[PDB]
Each structure stands twice: as structure tokens, then as C-alpha cells.
């Protein structure tokens, strides 16, 4: 038997500059190299990427965010490399003190730097979001990626922006650090009385769901690649034996049915619902509900 987890032989032809449609071809790189390494798992072609006004704005803005943080990490290190590498996970750029509430008056050394790095992240992410809608629109494709992406943006916006403003201070926001953002998470749950009693946390867990769905789905398309089932779009337009036997495993095992297109509707919604529910759970935490244990005792 052969399992199809790694390719057996690799073929290569001329680099693929891609479909044109309404794209502005003046914004595509040279094809990068070819990774024979990657070629065993997937495609071996790096590039071309598309970079235009929004792409630079995003990329530039996102490096600015990244550096503002890392600068601070050198200030904390005393500009010593040995220290920098030692305490890397321990450094942290924290939001303004509670005193400064929602103003932008905080000293650079006390969360003025946080506010700068936040602003840059705010530009970079929202730029990148508009990038995903426009890359699809130029190819005539539906904007399912931009809308699904909007779900993760939702949680991030609640965590660092929407809930801080609803609470009345930037200090409620997530810091920029490896171990420090971990402790904010533990802390948050303690203050609101065990997030385990937040019913939106619990659903967001159930959807995180996606491990099961993508385990099953990936397992299946591999199990039916002997009939070229990985070719899902033309199996949608003209059902073949791959789609028929993949429906029947589902149906014979546990009783309900999945179409080739249908299971991707299952897939996009399983995933988007993680962060969609989770954002609601955080948004309500501290704004409406002070103690989730106490809340679960009355349901009101």
C-alpha cells in the first residue's frame, strides 16, 4: 500500500505566472526559486507575489509595529545582546497605566510606545484585510476569504480595541510579549471568575471541532485521491466516483450526508465560529458580566 502523504516523483515545468483576469500585471514579482524541499509536500514554486499600494502600506506598517516592540526589548536589555537572547520571552511592551484611561497622553516610557505600536498594527491588519478582498475581486472570485478573515479581525479588535474602549482604559488591552501575553490570558480568566463558566468560551472551544473536521476531510480526500478527489471544483461541477465514495463513507459511518461543495460550507463555518463566538465572550466580559461563575448561578 502507498499512502500519498509525500509525493513519490516530482515534475517541474516553466514557472507559472498565473491567471490574468483583471489583475494589474505590473505588480507581480519575478518567480522566486523552486523548493524541491517543499515539492514533496505541496507546490515547489515560490512567487510571484503581488504588491501594490495596499501591500506596501501593510508590509511597511507591519514592520513598524514589529520594530517599535523590538526596540523596547533592546531598551530593556540594556542594549546587551547576551541579555536580549536570554530574556527574550520575558520582555514586554505594556499598555498605558490605568490613570491615562483612553487618552493618548501616556509617556513613551509608560505605554506611549504601546499606543504607537498598536496604531501601526491597526493599519497593517486592516490594510491586509482590504488586500484579501481586492486580490479576490480582481480574479472574479467570491469574497469568502475576506469575510472569513473578518472573523479573526473581530476577536483581535475586541481584545485590544473595542473592549478597552468599552472598559474605559487602554490598560485592559493585551501587552506585546511572549510570556506576558500568556499571563494576561491566565489573569483575565481569574478576574472574571473562570472563563470556563462563560458559555461563549465553551462554544468557541467546541468549534476549535475544526481539528476533527479537517482531520476527517484531509483523511478523506487522500483516501479518494486514487480517483483524483483532490480536484474538488470539477468534482462539484461533474460528480465522479471520488465524490460518491466520500459521501458514502460519511453516510455509512454516522448517517448523514456531505456533498463535495457541502463539506466546505461545513468547513468555513466551523472555523469562523471559533473567533466569532469568542469575541462575543470577551466583549461581554467585564462590560456586562463581572464574574462568570456568579452569572451562571442566576443566568442573569
Amino acid at each position: 500500500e502507498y499512502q500519498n502523504i509525500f509525493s513519490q516523483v516530482q515534475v517541474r515545468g516553466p514557472a507559472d505566472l498565473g491567471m490574468t483576469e483583471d489583475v494589474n500585471l505590473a505588480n507581480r514579482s519575478g518567480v522566486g526559486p523552486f523548493s524541491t524541499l517543499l515539492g514533496w509536500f505541496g507546490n515547489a514554486q515560490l512567487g510571484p507575489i503581488y504588491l501594490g499600494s495596499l501591500g506596501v502600506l501593510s508590509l511597511f506598517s507591519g514592520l513598524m509595529w514589529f520594530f517599535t516592540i523590538g526596540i523596547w526589548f533592546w531598551y530593556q536589555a540594556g542594549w546587551n545582546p547576551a541579555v536580549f537572547l536570554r530574556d527574550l520571552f520575558f520582555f514586554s511592551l505594556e499598555p498605558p497605566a490605568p490613570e491615562y484611561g483612553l487618552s493618548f497622553a501616556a509617556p513613551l516610557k509608560e505605554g506611549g510606545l504601546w499606543l504607537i505600536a498598536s496604531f501601526f498594527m491597526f493599519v497593517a491588519v486592516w490594510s491586509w484585510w482590504g488586500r484579501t478582498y481586492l486580490r479576490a475581486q480582481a480574479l472574479g472570485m467570491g469574497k469568502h476569504t475576506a469575510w472569513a478573515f473578518l472573523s479573526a479581525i473581530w476577536l483581535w479588535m475586541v481584545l485590544g480595541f473595542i473592549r478597552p474602549i468599552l472598559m474605559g482604559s487602554w490598560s485592559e488591552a493585551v501587552p506585546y510579549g511572549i510570556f506576558s501575553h500568556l499571563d494576561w490570558t491566565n489573569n483575565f480568566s481569574l478576574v472574571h471568575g473562570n472563563l470556563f463558566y462563560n458559555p461563549f468560551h465553551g462554544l468557541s472551544i467546541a468549534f476549535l471541532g475544526s481539528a476533527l473536521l479537517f482531520a476527517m476531510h484531509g483523511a478523506t480526500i487522500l483516501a479518494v485521491s486514487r480517483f483524483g478527489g483532490e480536484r474538488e471544483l470539477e468534482q462539484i461541477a461533474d460528480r465522479g466516483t471520488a465524490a460518491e465514495r466520500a459521501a458514502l463513507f460519511v453516510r455509512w459511518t454516522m448517517g448523514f450526508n456531505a456533498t463535495m461543495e457541502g463539506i466546505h460550507r461545513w468547513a468555513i463555518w466551523m472555523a469562523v465560529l471559533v473567533t466569532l463566538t469568542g469575541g462575543i465572550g470577551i466583549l461581554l466580559s467585564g462590560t456586562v458580566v463581572d464574574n462568570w461563575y456568579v452569572w451562571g448561578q442566576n443566568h442573569g
Binding site: 491567471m19 450526508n257 457541502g262 456586562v288
Partner: protein, 240 residues
């Protein structure tokens, strides 16, 4: 309070969503049938959805689903019991007949095309610029059956051009004809290709294609289905 409102509102949205999701996975294979092909009494709890229509690229028509459903081919089976729920025995050669693990679907007898309207799969001899870039080149290698007997040799690789992957092995049989073997169903080894699913005598049985440079969606199913079916039906001739 306001959080309790949020959570009932959600569970309602979710119920509507499950219903939506559920009816979307009914666009194929429904309405349910009885074993004799007539429409089953109990069709399940949800109704069929309003038909959506795909527009196939390249002027290849459309597809409205759900649509009328026929197998568009003869099924050589017969009941083994007098009540629903039991297996259906092949009345002929199940691989020759195309039932069971050897089933094929009557797809369009057309090749899948790439986004530029060209055949998606071409023999590498006729796909310019393509070559084996890593791994063992199977061309030249002899092909071996599950009875440990030589059935032919690889004379070409059939390649997906837009996705740049191997899809088939053009195996030259002993009479001079070729067949395609799914790439997913062979083991390329250092001195041979090995096919566990077919014994050597069933290689000439593999369905053949019409145009030597192109393979249609039908021919693809008939070949992949045949090769897969041997896993069950060629078992009387196999060791390990």
C-alpha cells in the same frame, strides 16, 4: 440580562445555520430511493433546496443542482435477500462490469481543462518544458503485479500541467498497447514500479482511452475505478 439575550439569540442563529448547512448537503444523491430505484417513502426531515446553477467555464454548459438523477449506465447486481438492507451480488465480472470497489461514474466524456482552456493532463512527451525534477524517474522501469509478475513497462508520465504533478503512469503492456495507471496506486521503487492492486493478467483489462494524448473525465473514472476494484477482486492472487 444582556448576556442571556446574546446566548439565546446565538443558539437560534446556530439552529438556522445547521438547517442551512444540512440542506446544502442534499444537492447530490437526493431524492432518496428504494432498492428498486423508486422514490423512497421517508425522504428525511429537511426538504430539498432551491436549485442553484453553476456556469461551467469554457462554454461547457451549466449544472443545476439538485437535478434529475439517473446512473446513465447499467448496473449488474441482484438482490441477495428478500428485504431491504442487504448486499447486492454481482451477476458478472465485477471489475469488467464496474460495480463495487470497481465502480465508475458516467462523467462527461471530455477532458478537464485548465483556466486557459487547455487539456489539464498531457503526456509529458507532449507537455513542453516538463521533466522529472526530484525522486526516481519511473520511465523505463518495468511494472510489476501483485502476483510478482511483470505486466509491462513505464513509457511515460502523464502530468497535471497547471498543478505540476504526476497523475498517471503510461504503462506499455506486452502486446504493445499502453494503459494508464493512477499515480496514487503504484509504488515507484529503485528497480521497478509495483502495483499491489492488480495481478499481471488484469492489466490488459484496464479500460483504454481514445485519443493517445488526452484522457477524459469518464476514462479517468473507468481506469481509477478498475484499478481500485482489484484491491478487493484481485485478492485471490496476491502475497506479502
Amino acid at each position: 440580562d444582556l448576556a442571556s439575550l446574546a446566548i439565546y439569540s446565538f443558539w437560534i442563529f446556530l439552529a438556522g445555520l445547521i438547517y442551512y448547512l444540512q440542506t446544502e448537503n442534499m444537492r447530490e444523491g437526493y431524492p432518496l430511493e428504494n432498492e428498486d430505484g423508486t422514490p423512497a417513502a421517508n425522504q428525511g426531515p429537511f426538504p430539498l433546496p432551491k436549485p442553484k446553477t453553476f456556469i461551467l467555464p469554457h462554454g461547457r454548459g451549466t449544472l443545476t443542482v439538485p437535478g434529475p438523477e439517473s446512473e446513465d449506465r447499467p448496473i449488474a447486481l441482484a438482490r441477495t435477500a428478500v428485504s431491504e438492507g442487504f448486499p447486492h451480488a454481482p451477476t458478472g465480472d465485477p471489475m469488467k462490469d464496474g460495480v463495487g470497489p470497481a465502480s465508475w461514474v458516467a462523467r462527461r466524456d471530455l477532458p478537464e481543462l485548465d483556466g486557459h482552456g487547455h487539456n489539464k493532463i498531457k503526456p509529458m512527451k507532449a507537455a513542453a518544458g516538463f521533466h522529472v525534477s526530484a525522486g526516481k524517474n519511473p520511465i523505463g522501469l518495468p511494472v510489476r503485479g501483485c502476483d510478482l509478475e511483470i505486466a509491462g513497462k513505464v513509457v511515460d508520465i502523464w502530468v497535471d500541467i497547471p498543478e505540476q504533478m504526476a497523475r498517471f503512469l503510461e504503462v506499455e503492456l506486452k502486446d504493445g498497447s499502453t494503459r494508464l495507471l493512477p499515480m496514487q496506486m503504484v509504488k515507484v521503487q529503485s528497480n521497478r514500479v509495483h502495483v499491489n492492486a492488480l495481478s499481471s493478467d488484469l492489466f490488459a483489462g484496464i479500460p483504454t482511452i481514445k485519443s493517445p494524448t488526452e484522457v477524459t473525465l469518464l476514462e479517468e473514472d473507468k481506469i481509477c475505478g478498475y484499478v481500485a476494484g482489484g484491491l478487493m477482486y484481485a485478492a485471490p492472487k496476491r502475497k506479502s
